[PDB]
Each structure stands twice: as structure tokens, then as C-alpha cells.
Design an enzyme around this catalytic site. Sequence first.
Site, PDB file in Angstrom:
ATOM      1  N   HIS A 351       0.781  -1.234   0.000  1.00  0.00           N
ATOM      2  CA  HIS A 351       0.000   0.000   0.000  1.00  0.00           C
ATOM      3  C   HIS A 351       0.822   1.299   0.000  1.00  0.00           C
ATOM      4  CE1 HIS A 351      -3.972  -1.927   0.598  1.00  0.00           C
ATOM      5  NE2 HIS A 351      -3.297  -2.814   1.309  1.00  0.00           N
ATOM      6  N   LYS A 542      -8.762  13.983   3.588  1.00  0.00           N
ATOM      7  CA  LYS A 542      -7.834  12.850   3.632  1.00  0.00           C
ATOM      8  C   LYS A 542      -6.914  13.111   4.819  1.00  0.00           C
ATOM      9  CE  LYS A 542      -5.587  13.134  -0.288  1.00  0.00           C
ATOM     10  NZ  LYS A 542      -6.662  12.744  -1.253  1.00  0.00           N
ATOM     11  N   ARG A 543      -6.220  12.084   5.289  1.00  0.00           N
ATOM     12  CA  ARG A 543      -5.279  12.270   6.391  1.00  0.00           C
ATOM     13  C   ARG A 543      -4.231  13.337   6.047  1.00  0.00           C
ATOM     14  NH1 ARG A 543      -5.403   8.370  10.757  1.00  0.00           N
ATOM     15  NH2 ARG A 543      -3.520   9.508  11.396  1.00  0.00           N
ATOM     16  N   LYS A 548       0.744  14.346   0.658  1.00  0.00           N
ATOM     17  CA  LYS A 548      -0.574  14.667   0.107  1.00  0.00           C
ATOM     18  C   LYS A 548      -0.699  16.156  -0.236  1.00  0.00           C
ATOM     19  CE  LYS A 548      -2.881  10.808   2.508  1.00  0.00           C
ATOM     20  NZ  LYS A 548      -3.626  10.109   1.398  1.00  0.00           N
ATOM     21  N   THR A 650      -8.305   6.480  -2.805  1.00  0.00           N
ATOM     22  CA  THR A 650      -9.653   5.954  -3.021  1.00  0.00           C
ATOM     23  C   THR A 650     -10.679   7.062  -2.869  1.00  0.00           C
ATOM     24  OG1 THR A 650      -9.807   5.191  -0.725  1.00  0.00           O
ATOM     25  CG2 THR A 650      -9.121   3.569  -2.385  1.00  0.00           C
ATOM     26  N   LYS A 654     -14.347   8.165  -4.957  1.00  0.00           N
ATOM     27  CA  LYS A 654     -15.605   8.577  -4.316  1.00  0.00           C
ATOM     28  C   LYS A 654     -16.135   9.902  -4.875  1.00  0.00           C
ATOM     29  CE  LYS A 654     -13.666   6.565  -0.053  1.00  0.00           C
ATOM     30  NZ  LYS A 654     -13.222   6.892   1.342  1.00  0.00           N
TER      31      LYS A 654
HETATM   32  O1  LIG Z   1      -4.678   0.962  -0.897  1.00  0.00           O
HETATM   33  C1  LIG Z   1      -5.498   1.711   0.001  1.00  0.00           C
HETATM   34  C2  LIG Z   1      -4.768   2.992   0.382  1.00  0.00           C
HETATM   35  O2  LIG Z   1      -3.695   2.626   1.277  1.00  0.00           O
HETATM   36  C3  LIG Z   1      -3.029   3.803   1.815  1.00  0.00           C
HETATM   37  N1  LIG Z   1      -2.092   3.317   2.851  1.00  0.00           N
HETATM   38  C4  LIG Z   1      -2.324   3.453   4.161  1.00  0.00           C
HETATM   39  S1  LIG Z   1      -3.779   4.259   4.761  1.00  0.00           S
HETATM   40  N2  LIG Z   1      -1.405   2.958   4.996  1.00  0.00           N
HETATM   41  N3  LIG Z   1      -1.466   3.006   6.225  1.00  0.00           N
HETATM   42  C5  LIG Z   1      -0.462   2.459   6.894  1.00  0.00           C
HETATM   43  C6  LIG Z   1      -0.381   2.433   8.283  1.00  0.00           C
HETATM   44  C7  LIG Z   1       0.834   2.076   8.879  1.00  0.00           C
HETATM   45  C8  LIG Z   1       0.943   2.037  10.271  1.00  0.00           C
HETATM   46  C9  LIG Z   1      -0.165   2.352  11.062  1.00  0.00           C
HETATM   47 CL1  LIG Z   1      -0.033   2.319  12.788  1.00  0.00          CL
HETATM   48  C10 LIG Z   1      -1.374   2.709  10.467  1.00  0.00           C
HETATM   49  C11 LIG Z   1      -1.487   2.745   9.077  1.00  0.00           C
HETATM   50  C12 LIG Z   1      -2.316   4.538   0.668  1.00  0.00           C
HETATM   51  O3  LIG Z   1      -1.617   5.671   1.193  1.00  0.00           O
HETATM   52  C13 LIG Z   1      -3.343   4.948  -0.414  1.00  0.00           C
HETATM   53  O4  LIG Z   1      -2.693   5.489  -1.567  1.00  0.00           O
HETATM   54  C14 LIG Z   1      -4.190   3.737  -0.846  1.00  0.00           C
HETATM   55  O5  LIG Z   1      -5.255   4.173  -1.691  1.00  0.00           O
END
Ligand SMILES: OC[C@H]1O[C@@H](NC(=S)N/N=C/c2ccc(Cl)cc2)[C@H](O)[C@@H](O)[C@@H]1O
EC number: 2.4.1.1
Lengths: 810, 810
Positions: A351, A542-543, A548, A650, A654
Amino acid sequence: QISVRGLAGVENVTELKKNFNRHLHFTLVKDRNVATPRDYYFALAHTVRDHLVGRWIRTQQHYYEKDPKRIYYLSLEFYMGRTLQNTMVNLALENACDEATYQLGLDMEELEEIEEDAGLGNGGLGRLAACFLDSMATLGLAAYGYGIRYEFGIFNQKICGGWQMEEADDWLRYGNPWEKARPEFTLPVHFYGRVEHTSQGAKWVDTQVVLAMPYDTPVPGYRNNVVNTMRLWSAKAPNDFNLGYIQAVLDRNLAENISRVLYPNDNFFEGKELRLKQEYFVVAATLQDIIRRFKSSTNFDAFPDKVAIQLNDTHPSLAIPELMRVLVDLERLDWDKAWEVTVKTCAYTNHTVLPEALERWPVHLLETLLPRHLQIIYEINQRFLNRVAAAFPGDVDRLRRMSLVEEGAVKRINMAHLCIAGSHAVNGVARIHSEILKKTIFKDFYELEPHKFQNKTNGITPRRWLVLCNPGLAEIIAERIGEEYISDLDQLRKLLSYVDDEAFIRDVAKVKQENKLKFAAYLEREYKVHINPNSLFDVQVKRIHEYKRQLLNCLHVITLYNRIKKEPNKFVVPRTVMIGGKAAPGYHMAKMIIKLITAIGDVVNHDPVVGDRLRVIFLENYRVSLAEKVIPAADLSEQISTAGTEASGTGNMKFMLNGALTIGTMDGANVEMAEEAGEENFFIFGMRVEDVDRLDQRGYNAQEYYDRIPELRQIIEQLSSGFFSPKQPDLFKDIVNMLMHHDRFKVFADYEEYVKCQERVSALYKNPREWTRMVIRNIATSGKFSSDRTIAQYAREIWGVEPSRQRLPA
Amino acid sequence: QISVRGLAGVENVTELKKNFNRHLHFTLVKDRNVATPRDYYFALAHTVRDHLVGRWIRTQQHYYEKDPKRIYYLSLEFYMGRTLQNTMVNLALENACDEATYQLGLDMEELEEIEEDAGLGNGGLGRLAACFLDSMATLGLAAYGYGIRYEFGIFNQKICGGWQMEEADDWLRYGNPWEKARPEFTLPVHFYGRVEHTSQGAKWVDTQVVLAMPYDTPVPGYRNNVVNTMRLWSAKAPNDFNLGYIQAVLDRNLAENISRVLYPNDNFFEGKELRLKQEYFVVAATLQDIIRRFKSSTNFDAFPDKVAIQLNDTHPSLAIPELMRVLVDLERLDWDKAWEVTVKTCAYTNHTVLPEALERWPVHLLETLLPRHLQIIYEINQRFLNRVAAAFPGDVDRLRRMSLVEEGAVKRINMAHLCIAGSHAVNGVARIHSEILKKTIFKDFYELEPHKFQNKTNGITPRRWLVLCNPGLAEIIAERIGEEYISDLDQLRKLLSYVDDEAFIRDVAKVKQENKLKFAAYLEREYKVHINPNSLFDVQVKRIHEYKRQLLNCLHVITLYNRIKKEPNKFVVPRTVMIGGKAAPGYHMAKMIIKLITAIGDVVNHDPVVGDRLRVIFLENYRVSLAEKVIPAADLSEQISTAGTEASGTGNMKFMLNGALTIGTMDGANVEMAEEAGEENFFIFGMRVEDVDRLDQRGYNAQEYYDRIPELRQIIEQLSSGFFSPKQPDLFKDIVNMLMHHDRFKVFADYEEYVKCQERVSALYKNPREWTRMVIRNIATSGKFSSDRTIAQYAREIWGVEPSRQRLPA
Ligand SMILES: OC[C@H]1O[C@@H](NC(=S)N/N=C/c2ccc(Cl)cc2)[C@H](O)[C@@H](O)[C@@H]1O
Ligand SMILES: OC[C@H]1O[C@@H](NC(=S)N/N=C/c2ccc(Cl)cc2)[C@H](O)[C@@H](O)[C@@H]1O
Ligand SMILES: OC[C@H]1O[C@@H](NC(=S)N/N=C/c2ccc(Cl)cc2)[C@H](O)[C@@H](O)[C@@H]1O
Ligand SMILES: OC[C@H]1O[C@@H](NC(=S)N/N=C/c2ccc(Cl)cc2)[C@H](O)[C@@H](O)[C@@H]1O
């Protein structure tokens, strides 16, 4: 009211009404005289959940009888959101419940707002798991989601003085009507201890035991009577734990802390022991469950024929050595056979390519916590590296590059390397991301085993992300092309023949306007903030991460403000700029970015010269339930990550499905979105991946941009001098310093093209008819991004199972 | 089957069956194919609990409408046991449910064994609260039980190598069907902080807040359609608690530890902060609830007319300064008026005279935890001592004796003195105990305010302790005198006219035999131990304490063994000696006593010469559910505390009601029991209180008894030399040393009379007809010891309310 929400028959409405009253009385122990809105929600939730039970029991019985290949989706995150409306939608109960509650004198939408989000995830990865479960049920696959039942999910975000504050997400406080505890299926999980070598193989002894108690949540398919299970594990101390007396009982908390809280640090891998415990906990409990179900069908040759395990990132990577441990140590299989079984069983989805997010566990942690697993990992590494040595003789640097063990100050295990070695399939989540994996970070592995590497472009479920959140748009679409598109999103292509249809153009624009009015009202009611519903709704949700580039958005906002201040009596297309998202609690820069956004708002929103032409609002506590509200209201979707950094995205999909146009870089799934819709119908700007690489080779010098762009210079001067923080002049010094001297994500490099592209957006928005026609062309080509397509590809290309749209008997 | 268990009508049985199947499906999410016995229990529990809801809602609505005076029974302990059978009994559903389950192919008695005890108490005090709740509901009083919902109740006792082991009583693991969480009535409780004095009175500030979440449990009256509430508080952290991030969430456990575990130390007051927090927690939350309900009827003159608060021992004594705090600081009443209200509202029940059990809280603890309450206590003390000084001028030692503040190394607050000062009524729990209070420990207070001091002799509910646990005896009684006695136990006197009835004599003896066979079978099935059901069942079950003199019982057992070994071919009445009960985990001597009992068993039970003439069994994990089994099976009840030490006893009353004869000292309620039955029908022995006092004045010399009683000498020699512990010769040195040199409870002094009296018991048992006739005379005169009588006396003499046997409409 609307057709896609189902029939409201006399018999069903009467039955819903009486079961509602039954639950209020017998379940909630209340009568209408003292019942609160929350009591009414729970009565409705219990009424609706009753309709799931028969289908749930017979689906699971059906799998036991037919014994299909089972798909186990392992994730530490399932970002589910609310369940009530989703259940109603998938069971065709929405109109009936709407009517039933109306006749009881209740507003169902009001009751729906009472439900807490199941916020058991951080963002994209967690939400993807949720969409995937929905699609697997809809496609009739024998699928199980396995994860952790966190007592506390992602924190609730409060904004105080412009700063993010975190508070505990106590989502279980009032009880969860959507779960069934299964304490009878409680399983032991082992930690610590030591390895004994005997005549009859290795033995893991003197362990501490934590119990894993499962909780089952239903996953209903879309009107197919399929109800799959999401099983989440909760940590329980054994009854003789620590067994002066009082302390021993109080110390039970230590064991149960494993499932207490979701780690929110999506920016930076933290090698914390508790997180490692969480990762093993889910894996150990899940694998026992898988094996039990497999034995209840000696011969493990058939294991990969009956079991697929999908690893959602490296978080459950310990499944690989755990499966080996069980097969070798407990079942007494030889190594080579156990390994063949493991590889054929496991598949791994990556990811991200950001190095700081990659899990690299210190050896000393694994040595103490999981001594047998470390030994197994070492053996995996030796045998793997012997294969590499044979394929690439004399290539000594390849050997150290590919090793699962990283040498250095502290020795670490690279969990991504472990996953590739022990999986028959490795996939990225968008075409460009999967290509980057083969070309860069896993190039060595691709050269060794090219057949392992696949692409599975992400998707979103059109049930939650169209029908549920945007019924108005779903209905005007169904009026023209029928209801079939809901489980076959490619049918939206039929809307291309309506791009010149005056009635349809008017309806699409009307639905958007209604959504914008509804959201403008929500903001006034729940947050007392006022906006102009005729302005362009410019949203980035988004986060908060540097990659980003919420900061690039900030720079544009300030540009617009400065241009207005320079020529106040010149016409500009009004904008409401909305930015929302949570920052990981320990991510200082991301916290500074939030403060910047609010600080900009404080200046912009109170400038009389600006008027209602520009508004900057920080959307507090962005979460699935808020996404369902804001996304249908959006006109412009900001997808502006530096090329090569957003694996897929994603949120982008949406917005596309819900009638917003996209301004974005050629990054992640944006590339495929532009390809589906046509580049003419997308607002593409900025460096491509190749341009970023060129700039890196040359060396990125931000000063160059500052020197040559006067408007950019002004902004940096304003930030430095304290224009956006009059009482704390140096507040944003960290931000300026980063932008000027250590910006990994080249914010300045895309600034000019971004601003230019934004001008073209405003230009199109001035022509409502042409704006809407381009919107229709986006919606019409959004079909590829259904998670039904994504899951069907996993099914056929990785899991070796065929999806089915066939109903189970009701 | 039997009449007292109600009607099994066709309509009711059919309805119970279908609701059972409904719950199994919709509530448990199972079908008959995979359902376990536990699933069946829960389906039955849900089926039965449905019948409570209407009555529960309308009882509470009735109190709101009629606004009677409310009785609040405050206790840190409610030893409830199982709820299923009790609910069925009180609703007349037992036969119907028995039939319904039979037709479903299930044994209801088997399902009943699955329910966990609600073990939220230690022994007599906690069980008394439970019996009291049952009687208050049966007598139609607007009564509420308020306490703490401990996550862990009294520990489960395991015996390993003869030693007590403790394990956590995780009674909520599978969920509790008898509770309804009421998170909407959640209340804040304050701790720590400091006191600010302003112009407008004192203010308690900078406090830490813990939330109190109530859980409601129904208390059904006996066939009167009354359902009262027991409300238990659970501790919850506020959502901004400690709000690096992960730790802050994990630290929430600290606040929630308040309701985690029941303190098991019934032998020795421990000034532990957590216990103090528990005591304030229940009090603070409860009083807010009381006041809310009172305001939902400004004028606090009527408060004592509408509210009674009963303090169960000094554990909730903080109610007195807390009520003052609320009335003075929050409601702004003057001190004198607030005090008048408080005194008229509160009443205090004392449960012991043992000095080491009296709560004497260090001032420094109260200073830190509850600074405002300490100030209030000081003011109470000053004003009280001024009253004493005026009544007894110049009596300076009286002033220091009566002070709430005890001077010494650490200053302490005497909570018993606080309770007397702030209550309009103070009662003991048996006539002799109440007299001892006036003559000794509270003599000074009695002289000052004689009107305050009352007696309320304890009782037990004849629903649980006859109808539920001994249906056979209940039925043979009902056959002769009808069913009315169940809620009017004095009617058992009518059985005196059957003392010469040959049919009745035979039936009483038969019921006992059946009970003994049932219990002899239970022991073989669940504990694999074999007993002779024709032997005299000699039982002592109660918490292990030196004052209760399980050791004196041990000495008799060894005497019997030695006499058999001396004259093996001489006839002796066979005995099964059963001793059971838990020891407080930190009570070393009590733990040694358990080990002694098992060690005796190990020698006695495996001696071939003994045969089946003598068996010594330690009854593991004595608890309410076990009491319900063993008490109906008993022939001889051991109530052998040193005179003046057992305030009342209630176990004694349970045995009397169930057809066992009593060997006992003239202590606690034994005195009144012998008085009711006639001394000829009781096996009384040993020193009276006056004889104990005489011996204390002279000085107790245990050596004298050792020197003059050869059989006692032999036993002490055996214990010392290692006869009962061959491999650890000195194991019982602590026990011998205590007996010989520091025995507070004069075990040796009662030895000769005890053994002699035991000979008279064996003599009577040889004549089955005369044994049973004396039994009938005990059962016939057990009426006074119904908690219905006890509660009616509290109602009339303390609370100022009239009980009612009238039905509420169904
Ligand atoms: O494929 C689905 C999405 O995955 C996301 N990866 C994310 S949320 N990782 N989180 C990692 C993570 C690592 C450690 C902790 Cl404690 C919490 C979360 C990608 O950034 C995004 O491009 C993609 O669309
Ligand atoms: O909410 C209170 C408690 O409810 C319990 N649920 C029980 S008894 N039946 N559920 C049945 C059921 C039926 C259908 C569906 Cl779709 C889900 C659950 C949960 O096990 C427990 O974790 C929770 O705290
Ligand atoms: O057992 C699972 C959960 O059940 C819940 N009970 C609910 S939803 N209804 N009860 C209704 C009810 C009806 C009658 C009676 Cl006599 C008691 C309760 C409890 O609130 C919760 O604490 C518990 O864990
Ligand atoms: O009146 C009912 C019964 O009360 C008993 N008192 C009991 S159980 N006190 N427990 C005190 C206690 C103290 C501290 C702790 Cl942490 C736990 C329990 C009397 O001993 C008995 O004679 C009488 O019949």
C-alpha cells in the site's frame, strides 16, 4: 419516496412497526414516555438486525455444506463507519423503515445520526478492507474478514485555538448492536517463552498466554441474501493470570491492553512492542480458526485449494512464519512441504513506497517476544538467499539488498521482504504503483520471480459511496438506465448517451445543488459556521501528510486572497475551500499544517473586502460518516500528491462517482481515472513521475522558485513575517524552513502549474452547462473503480475462485 | 410435578416454547444443530426475563405517580447468587418452564447449573443485603439497592495440595442477561482537588473526575407483581482523561479500576486507597441519584419524609458528610438545617464487635482524596463533642473516647462514631449483639442518646432458602398447611400439631434422605469423592475465621478418630463431617486451618480401620449456589463461635429452616433460635458471654486445659509431632503455638462441653423417630427468622413506612 430505496409494503411496514415497539419494550426496557432519540435508534437497529439473522445462519451453513475455497482477508484495520443504513440498503428495507418510523412519528435520518462510526482504521487502507468485504459478499464469495476489536478506534479530533486535540473514541460505550460475542470460540495466543530442541523437533515453552475472544459482525451482500462474517478478536486474560491478590486482578489489564487501542501513526513506523503484540495476536488467533475450519471439512496438500490468506500490507506478515510454525512444529510436516503450502496459501498487497512507513522490526524485539518465529524467519532467509545466489551467482550486493535481515546499528527484519518470499502473489493498488514496485523498491524480487508481481487497481463500493450517501443521484441515474448498475457499475457508461440531454443535465446539476444546500445547513447546525452555497465547493479531505500536499492547497488559497486584495473590485468565481483530515498525534509538521489552515481561515473569513467570495473552513473530525456527507456536496476534488507518492488513493474515486471534477497530479489511480474519463475531462497538472526523478538527479532547489515567482515570494514573506499569526510572529517558521530547505515533496515545483490549472477550473465553473456536461462524462466512466471489479480480479487472478451474482434462497 | 412450583398451562407452555426458540435464533444467533447447553441456558434466561419487563416498568412508573417514601439500601456487597430459578419462583413460572424445556428435550436443572453466581459479596453481610432486597420487594416497599458492579466478585477457591488457591471470578465473561446498562444516567464523581473558601461559602475545585455508569437489575417480589431495582455503579473514565497518546488511552484503566474487584478481606480492615475510592464512589453517585429523584417529585424539610438511607455497616459511612456537603455547599442550606435533615435521613446497621474489622481511616488519606469531607467531619466532631461536654461536664476521658478523631501515631477517623453521630437509628443484628453494643463498645453513645439504639434480628428469605433450594420440604409442608407460609413464615407454627403425625414424620425424614442422596451424588459427579449417605451429615459452612472456631470442630474430628483407633470394634454413629468456606487471601491462620482440615481428611479417609464410619471432606468454593445444595442435605449445623463474637449469623437460620438440628454456643441469633424452638430441641454447649468475661478477668491459660484433659493433650502432641503431616513435621507449629499461647477465642475452654454435647447428638441420631420429631419442632418455630419479619421491623421502627402484601395489577 424514491425507487432505489425499495418497496414500502403494507405487511412489511406493519411488521417493522410492531417489532420496533417490541424491542423498545423488551430489549431497551423503556416506554414512549421516557424514551430518548438514542433509545429509538437502538430499537430500530435491533429491528433491522433481526432481518439479518436467518440469512447469516444459512449463508454460513451453506459454506459448511458446499465447502468452497475460503478467502481470509487479514487486516489490522477495518474502517466500517455506520452500519444501520448500509444494512437497510443491502436488504432493500430503507423505504419500509422510513415509512414505519414516519408512522411512529420519528425521523429516520435523525435516528441514523445517533450511531457511532466503527472507526477501526486510519484512512485508505482500513476503508479499502471495508469496501472489499462489501464486494466479496455481493459477489458471493466465501470470505471472512479477520481483525482486532479495538476498544478505542481512531481518536475523535477536536480543534482548539486552531490546534488539533485528540480524545478517546469510546465507540462501545452504549453497546454495539451489530456484534455477537462468541466466547465459546475463545483461543489461546502465546507470547515470550523460549525454544527447546528435542529429538522430535523444536518446542515453544514457558510462554505467557493471552486469550483471544471473537466477536462476529455480519457483512450483507447487495440484495443477494448472502451474509458473510467479519470476525474481530478481543484480548482476555486467563483466570489464573498473575495468580498481592488485588494487584494480581488489577494486572489483568496488561494482557487485555493488546486490543485496547488502534495505532494512529500512519506516517511513521514505530517499533513499539504493543503494536507487535497486536500483529501477532490477530495472526495467531486467525490461523487457529482457519485450520480448525479446514480440519472440520491430516492432508495439508489440499490446504491451498481450500484456503486463501490475503495480507493487507505487512501488518499481518507474521502469518507466514506462524503458518510454518504450526505446519512444522505441531503438524510435523517437513520444511519443504510446509513452505510450498504456505507460499500457495498467502498473498501480499502493498500500500506504499514511502520508506519511513515500511515495517522493519528490531531483531531483539522478535527474540524476546516471538523466539520461535525469529528462528523460522532466519531459516526462511537462508533458503531464500541460497535461491538468489544460484540465480545470480557472484552478485554479492544483491544478496544483502534482498536479505530479510537488515544489518546495521540494530539488526532489523524487513517484513516486506518476508511477505514477498512467502507469497505466491504480490500486488500494488494502481497501475503506476505496481509498475514503480517492479522498477524500484522490489526490482530485485521482480527479477527473481516476475510471475509473482501483479496489479489490482483499488475500487470503492457503489453501495455506500453512491446509493447510501447520494440517493438523489442514484435515483436520477436509475430513472434512465435502471437499477442494475448498482452491482454492475460499468453500466454507467450508458449515461454517455445523455451528455446532450437537457433534462438530464438539469437533474444532475439540481442534485448537486440540493447536496450543497444540505451540507451548508449541516455546517450551520452542528458547527455554527456560515457558507455561500452558490460558491464552488473546493474540497480536500484525507489524512494530513506532507506527501498529500495540503500545503500546496494552502499556497493556492493565499494566492487567491492576495489577488483579491490587490484587485478588490475584479470579479472572481466564489469558492468555499474545505480542507479536512486527522494528523497522527506525533506528527509535528502535520499538526502545524492544520494550524496553518485554521490561521488562514481566521484572516480570510473575516476580511470585509473579501466578502463571500472566498471562505476557508477546516472540516473537523473527518471520518467515514463525514465523508458520506461532504463528498456528495463537492464540486472540485483535490488529489494533488507529488507524483509517485500516493499508491492509489480511493477518496479520488468517491468524488468521481458523486459528480465532482478532479484537479490532480498524474499519481496513483488519478492516472487511470483520467484515462477512463479522457484527459480533456480532467484537470491534470504538475510533474509526472519522470519529471520528479529528473529533478532529484539535478537536485531540488526551492530557492530557485522563490526567486523567480513573485507571488510565491509574497506568500513566503507573509508566513515568515507573521501576517497569519500577528501575536506569534515566528509560529510558522518550521513550515517555511521545511519548504525552503528540506521539502521531500517539491511543493514549490508544482505551484505555478497548479495555480494556472485552478484558473481553468474557475473558467469552466462560470459555464454551468459545460461544467455539468464534463461531470456527466466523469460519472459515466467511473465504472472501473467499483470494488466489485477489483474483487473479481483478486478472485480470478490471485485466489482462484469464481464470483457469483446468484441469489441465495430467502 | 409439585404444586408449589405453579401451574403448567397449555397456553403458557406453548408460548414459553416459541419464545425460547425465538431467542435461540434472533438473540443467540444459533440453531439447534450447533447450540451448546450454555446457549440453551441463555435462551431460557432471555425467555424468563421477558416476563419481568412489564412488571418492572409499571412498578417504577407506579412509584413515580404515587411518590411514596423511598428506601435506599446502601451496601458495598450484594451476594445475589443465581437469578434464573429465583425469578421463576417469584413469578410462578417454574413448572411451566420445566414442562416447556422438557418438551424441547432439555433438562432445566442442567441448564440452571450453567448460570454463574453473582458473587458480589464475602459472606453474611452481603447475603443479608440480598435477602433484604427480596423481602422489601415482597412487602411492597419502594426500595432500591445501591452498590458497585464489580467486574470480579469473590474469588473462586481452588484447593491444591490441601492449600487454598485463588482465581479471578470473571462472572461477566459470557454476559449478564439480568442487567440493563443505563449509560444515559451516567454521573460524575469527584476525587482529590482542594478546598477554596470564597465570600459565598466553600468550593471543592481542581478535582479529578470519574464517571459512574449505572446498571439496573430487577428484584421481583413473591407473586405480587412488584419488581424493584438494584442499581450497581461501574467506573468509567471521561473521554478527555489524560488527554503520549497511546499511554493516555491505556491509563484510562486507572480510573476504571475503582469497580474492578471486590475486596475479600473480611477479617482485617485494610486502609487501602482503592477501597476508600470504592466507598466514596458508591456514595457520591447514589446520593446524586437520590436527590435527582427527590427534586423530580427547593424545600429540603421534606427530604427525610421522602427518603430513608440505610447504611450497611460503615462501608458507605461517607454518605453522612457527602449529604452535608451537597446540602451546605451546593444547595446553600445552613449547617443546622442540613444536619437535622441528614440525621433524620440516615440509619446505621452494625455487623461486628471485633476491633480489627472496624474502619478507622488515616486522616492523611482523607486529606488527599476527599479534602472537603475531612473538613466536614472535623466540624461534625466539634459540634458533637460540644454536645457531649454539655451533657457530661468535666468528663474529659469521655470526650476522647467518643471523638470521631482518634489521636495516635497516625490520626484516624472512626467511621462507626461518625455513623452514630449522623444517624437517627443505630441497630445491631441480634438481641445479644444489640445489648453488647449498648453495654460495651458504644456504651458512651448509648448514655448520650439512648433512643437511637435498636435491635433488628437478622432473617433469611424463605423463597431462596426453602422453596427454591428445598422444593421437597416446601411441598410436604404445603400439603398440610397450604402455600400461605411462603410469604408469612410464622404459619409454620401450625406444623407443631403434626409432631406426632406418623405420615408427616416419615415424609420429613424421606425428604432429608432424598436431599442427602442428591448431594452424595453431586460430590461423586463434580468432585469424584465418595460418601456414605446413611451417615450423619455434620456440616460447618461459613467463611474461615478464628472466631468461628473451625479449629474446635477439627479437635472434635480428631477426638472421634482417636477414639475409633483406640476401640476399633466398638459401634459409633457414622459421620460425614463437611467443612467449607473461603479464607481472605492475606489471612495466614485461616489458610493454615484449611490445610489442617484437608490434612486430617488425608489421614482419616484412608485409614482402613475407620471404614465408612468417619469421613472428613473440605467443601471447595463455598458460595451461594453451593449453600443451596448442602444446607438441605445437612443433619447437624455447626454454629460454634465463641460467645459474644458472632453478631448474628444467618447460615444458622438457613439450616434450621431446612431440617437440620443445631449444635451451638449461646452466641448471636443462636440464642433467639433456641428460645423459639425451646432449649430442649437445641444442642447448646459452652461458655456464655458472662463466662468468657469471667475468664478474661482471671486470665485465659490454655496450658491448664492441656494439663487436665488427656484426650486434648494427645491431639496437641499429634499436631506437634507431625502425625497429620509426615513429610513436614513442623507444618502446624503456628496453629499449636496460637492455641497454647495466644488464642483470643478460647478453643480449649469449650472443648470438653463440645465433645460431650456431640455425644448427645450421636445418641439422638440413633433414634430416627425422635431425631425427626425434634427436627419438626425446629422447622415449626423457624418463622421469626424470615427476613420478611426483619424488614417489616425496619420499615415500621426505622424507616417510617408500612409494608403491603397487596398485588400490583398484572
Ligand atoms: O490501498 C489503500 C490505500 O492505502 C493507503 N495506505 C495506508 S492508509 N497505509 N497506512 C499504513 C499504516 C501504517 C501504520 C499504522 Cl499504525 C497505520 C497505518 C495509501 O496511502 C493509499 O494510496 C491507498 O489508496
Ligand atoms: O449490545 C449489547 C451486547 O449485545 C450482544 N449481542 C447479543 S446477546 N446478541 N446479538 C445478536 C445479534 C443478532 C443479529 C446481529 Cl446482525 C448481531 C447480533 C453482544 O454479544 C455484546 O458484545 C454486546 O455488548
Ligand atoms: O448480556 C449482554 C448485554 O445485555 C444488555 N441488555 C440489554 S441490551 N437489554 N436488556 C434488557 C433486559 C430486559 C429484562 C431484564 Cl430483567 C434485564 C435486561 C446489558 O445492558 C449489557 O450490560 C449486557 O452486557
Ligand atoms: O449481619 C449479617 C452478618 O454480618 C457479618 N459481618 C460481615 S460478613 N462483615 N463483613 C465485613 C467486611 C469488612 C471488610 C471487607 Cl473488605 C469485607 C467485609 C457478621 O459476621 C455476621 O454475624 C452477621 O450475621
